Amino acid sequence: PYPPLLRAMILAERQKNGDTSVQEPLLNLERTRMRPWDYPAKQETKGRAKGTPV
Amino acid sequence: RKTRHDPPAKSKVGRVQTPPAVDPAEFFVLTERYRQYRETVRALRLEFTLEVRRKLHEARAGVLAERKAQQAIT
Amino acid sequence: RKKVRPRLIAELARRVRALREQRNQPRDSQLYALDYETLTRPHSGRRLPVRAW
Amino acid sequence: PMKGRFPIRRTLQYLGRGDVVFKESVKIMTVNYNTYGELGEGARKFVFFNIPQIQYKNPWVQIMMFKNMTPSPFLRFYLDSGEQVLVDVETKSNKEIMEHIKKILGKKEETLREEELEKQQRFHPGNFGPRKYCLRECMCEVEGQVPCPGLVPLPKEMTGKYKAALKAST
Amino acid sequence: KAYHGGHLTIRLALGGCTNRPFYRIVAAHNKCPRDGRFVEQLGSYDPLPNSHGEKLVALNLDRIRHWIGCGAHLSKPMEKLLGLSGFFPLHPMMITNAERLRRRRAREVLLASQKAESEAKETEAS
Amino acid sequence: SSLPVSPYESEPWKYLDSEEYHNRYGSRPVWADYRRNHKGGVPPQRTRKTCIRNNKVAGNPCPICRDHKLHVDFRNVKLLEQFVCAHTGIIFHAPYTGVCMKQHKKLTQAIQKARECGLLSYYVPQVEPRDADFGTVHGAVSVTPPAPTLLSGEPWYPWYSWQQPPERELSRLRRLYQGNLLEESGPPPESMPEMPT
Amino acid sequence: EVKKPAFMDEEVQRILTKITGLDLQKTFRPAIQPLKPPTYKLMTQAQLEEATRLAVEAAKVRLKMPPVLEERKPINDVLAEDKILEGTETNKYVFTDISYNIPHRERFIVVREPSGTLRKASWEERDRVIQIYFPKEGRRVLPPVIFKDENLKTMYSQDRHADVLNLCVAQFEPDSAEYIKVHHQTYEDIDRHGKYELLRSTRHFGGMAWYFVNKKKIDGLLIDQIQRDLVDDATSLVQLYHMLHPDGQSAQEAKEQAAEGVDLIKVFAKTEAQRGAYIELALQTYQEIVTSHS
RNA sequence: AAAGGUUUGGUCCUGGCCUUAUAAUUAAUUAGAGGUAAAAUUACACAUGCAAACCUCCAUAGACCGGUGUAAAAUCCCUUAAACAUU
Ligand code: FES
Ligand SMILES: [K+]
Ligand SMILES: [K+]
Ligand SMILES: [Mg+2]
Ligand SMILES: [Mg+2]
Ligand SMILES: [Mg+2]
Ligand SMILES: [Mg+2]
Ligand SMILES: [Zn+2]
Known part of the structure; x- marks a missing residue:
């Protein structure tokens, strides 16, 4: 579902524009699915430490 | 705030990390809430990203945009 | 304007510094060396986090 | 007494009375007029009275005027496309000249109003900040909201000094 | 200042006086000072209850959607504000903290009953 | 330490209709025959802070302070009108009438209170209604169809509620954080426990 | 069904405008405000008549009647009931959408209560917050104190009914209960004391006659x-009735x-007039004076 | 500026100085408490303490915040282009 306020703003716009429907607004999560936090990252784009000793 | 060229304090050389203790039941429930919350927020950020680009295209090359350009030339 | 003048020393310094970095690049055996008694890297003195000990 | 003839021409109100706002195409307006003659009186009056008003509303347009170079006065506009619009202003009153150029190369009232509204899009009355940009600096100014401590002292229980004392007492 | 690196963020800028806090919701580069240069003001938050007992939040939901669509991050207090409004889902830690408070008051209620029972034993002793 | 006591304290408006007022002031304002003593031709931009300090009176008491029977009350409209411009309806600044800053603030508050209660008239501009359209059929001011979760009584999102972790996952965390653990927590109370009092 | 006439019906607006009247001296009575030195123009009789015509055009726009609407219905809609947040907050949050280009009656103003219920802001809450973020000249965030019955009665004693109504239009919305309450109180006071002349050549005369017609008390x-x-x-x-x-x-x-004409008034007296006996007497006396003198 | 004082034996003109208003710093004399705002001789030299960490190792950050007015007529506004140590 959409968040409570954002759902009401969608349904309100439907009625204003003349769209008559009782369909429930739904968010699609397929396009934006997150990898696990421990998924291997890109080593090529990672930094390397400098060569000045402390 | 210090710069990278500043010398470190002598009262904190002994400092070592104290990681927080973990409650197994609450840690897992919280980890799942973050994953589900962040997925919902990514879907909404994408919906907002599309409205920005839709509105931009309508202004740049919408019906009204094209008519006014030719109307002026005529 | 026209009173802004070149800064040769800055130009020389930038190039010279960059050259030295390429010549004296460290190796993985040095950057990632470890002293297992203290669990601290000698190259930088970085002490590993506790959860990794 | 303000110097010169018709010193009203050197007032901001007069300069703002101009109504000819050129389209973005207009880049240059050359004015060719004669200082002596009878059929060029309107052209001479147009340079005297109207050219300041046109420049004031069109600061980026180059107005260059040439005197006694041709038998008759005319106006030539140079547009960004490369087109050249010649206007003949002989036997034409200064008011007539202004109306002619307004029609052919002047922005309409509708276009100018839209630009004004778009300019003010980012000003919001609800926004808080300095007087230069906003109506109210702080929410304390709003009626019913907690007033500024400087004008009106806060209750003791709402003060960090008091809260710290209780924590020590605990 | 001439910043190099960083991102746009939506955060709360603190205003007001001592013991009288007031916040401006703004979109700003993350490296800018808290109360300094911003890009747009997106609303305001008054955290002190008013005469009617209402904490007043103003959200420019059209411009907020615009800046989230352009990559603007959100600070954690602003993520909490959007959750209370209903524009965003409730933040994970808003729910967790509410659970912790429920578990902490349950202990207090139980202890008070135990103390009352201990006091009842004192009543039995007379 | 004995300031005189006015007989008109209860009903201040009475004084301005009495014969004593007419003889002293006639039909002119009470500040008409007052002049400020100051060096130079341009006077200071503020009047003296107050004419009365601890029952003592200053050298040249202001129009309000010099006459004790005059009372600055929102109900004494006839006195208040003398301190407001009849043509523009603007309250005069203190240097104009020569009243002290204390009485000027008191007069300003009495004038503002009198106007708010309608005792003292002022010009009300004619303003148009706020909204061009007066419809109340938009969802914001109307009824939104109730969401499915709201009708059933469920949380808006399933993860709002506490969902017991699987036992295998609780063991996986006890191994990962072995040696730095807290006591396992069960389901939280269904409602907020009533605050003990 | 024959539609019930409305306040804005072109026929009703014609009749209400006529009975209201016009008076350039009353419509443009001098305002007690900061003044500027007057300007002067030399004008012929044609130019003067043209200027008077423009004055009558402006007096028409000045006399535009304010809307007469029915009382709004209380907003009682719950968007959500998130009970997880019960007891975690002590004060209500009021969230206002302040996007510039939304009509005020189409903005979303919600309230998160301490119990956790997310509900829509009531009508009183909507008007207060819209003044705080879109302030209107003339309107105050909190309801003024002049509208109390004791304070309003004072304004009526001073014959300041057009002011009571001009303030009621600056502060309250036309469909609010407070707006309807004050107007119906002012109109009732005019009736009892026969002070109908106070609102002539003003924008408030139409609503007053409208109120009397609907309430069947046009006798006065x-x-x-x-x-x-x-x-x-x-x-x-009598035609509008x-x-x-x-x-x-x-x-x-x-x-x-x-x-038709005077006959219509005589018909009303016999049939539906609350005080028909007096309407005929005044109507008869008018006829006698008109006939006797002319 | 709504002006004023001051050249002469006297009048008029010209013309400068000064007075009256407003504000900041310092000083003399004097002074209860409370709320708020501000804090400032010096790019001269500095004892001492603190001001940058985080984290299952890699990385990321310490390029910010904070400070001063050093240098320079140094700038403003506007155009084009390309990038970012970014999102
Ligand atoms: S200026 Fe608003 S609280 Fe002080
Ligand atoms: K002089
Ligand atoms: K002399
Ligand atoms: Mg990692
Ligand atoms: Mg000092
Ligand atoms: Mg800074
Ligand atoms: Mg210098
Ligand atoms: Zn006084």
């Missing part, structure tokens, strides 16, 4: 219009007798 306004020699207005008022009450005994009697 007719008696006063006749005594002021405004008998064309009195006839138009026969338009909003078509099935009334008076409206059916005028159709039977095809009454």
